[PDB]
């Protein structure tokens, strides 16, 4: 296979194929972020939908001026 | 012209509200469902006979004696998808069902048309629901009725000289 200057420079960033952290690793933390993100999408959705109505948050072309 | 025929038929027979046409629909929708289903389960249970760089179709050779998929596995899947006894383990029974359902349904669709041909029409629930005073309480049937009326009054706008379309 052909080596190149830039190929030699980038080699380490593509040398860890298959490498895993043990067991469940950081899965629970990820899960917490998924829960929070779900909640966020739910929030912005309900804002857009006018099911969630917030003071000073006028969901309209007339938002300000 | 086909669409015309259909629209006018709805107007004059309320075919949608006729149980034979509904049977036709269960028939063709069901036929398709089961077609896609059967297709999918059989495709799902093809015996590995090929490599990934070739079509799985070359794994079956025309006229071979051995079956090309594993029905026991197919049945194993579908029987778990719903429940065991809702699945066919008999290929002959399964294919007979596949034959009979759309065919019987479409027989009913055909008979729907063939009987509405003699003006035994769809269910008529116009003003079926009435309140304590006697006010008409519309149902979805009545909105259907309004559509039918539109169709009725506009079709062949020059063909009628008299108030009732009796044929």
């Amino acid at each position: 296979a052909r080596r190149t200057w830039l190929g030699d420079i980038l080699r380490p960033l593509n040398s860890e194929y298959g490498k895993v952290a043990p067991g469940w690793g950081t899965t629970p933390l990820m899960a917490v972020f998924m829960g929070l993100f779900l909640v966020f999408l739910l929030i912005i959705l309900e804002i857009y939908n006018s099911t969630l109505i917030l003071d000073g948050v006028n969901v309209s072309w007339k938002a300000l001026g | 012209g086909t669409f015309n025929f259909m629209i006018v038929f709805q107007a004059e027979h309320n075919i949608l509200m006729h149980p034979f046409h509904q049977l036709g629909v269960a028939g063709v929708f069901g036929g398709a469902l089961f077609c896609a289903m059967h297709g999918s389960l059989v495709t799902s249970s093809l015996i590995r006979e090929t490599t990934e760089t070739e079509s799985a179709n070359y794994g079956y050779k025309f006229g071979q004696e051995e079956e090309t998929y594993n029905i026991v596995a197919a049945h194993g899947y579908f029987g778990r998808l719903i429940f065991q006894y809702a699945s066919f383990n008999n290929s002959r029974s399964l294919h007979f069902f596949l034959a009979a359902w759309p065919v019987v349904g479409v027989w009913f669709a055909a008979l729907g048309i063939s009987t509405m041909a003699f003006n035994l029409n769809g269910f008529n629930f116009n003003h079926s629901v009435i309140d304590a005073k006697g006010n008409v309480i519309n149902t979805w049937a009545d909105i259907i009725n309004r559509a039918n009326l539109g169709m009725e009054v506009m079709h062949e706008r020059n063909a009628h000289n008299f108030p009732l379309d009796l044929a």
Partner: protein
């Protein structure tokens, strides 16, 4: 020899109990007059 309260049992009753309740309701409905 056989268990009684299984997933299958629960599933069956989640459908069957309301079905009978509802059939009873609708039966009652056939006698309502304006």
């Amino acid at each position: 020899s056989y268990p009684i309260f299984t997933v299958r049992w629960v599933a069956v009753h989640t459908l069957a109990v309301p079905t009978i309740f509802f059939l009873g309701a609708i039966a009652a409905m056939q006698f309502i007059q304006r």
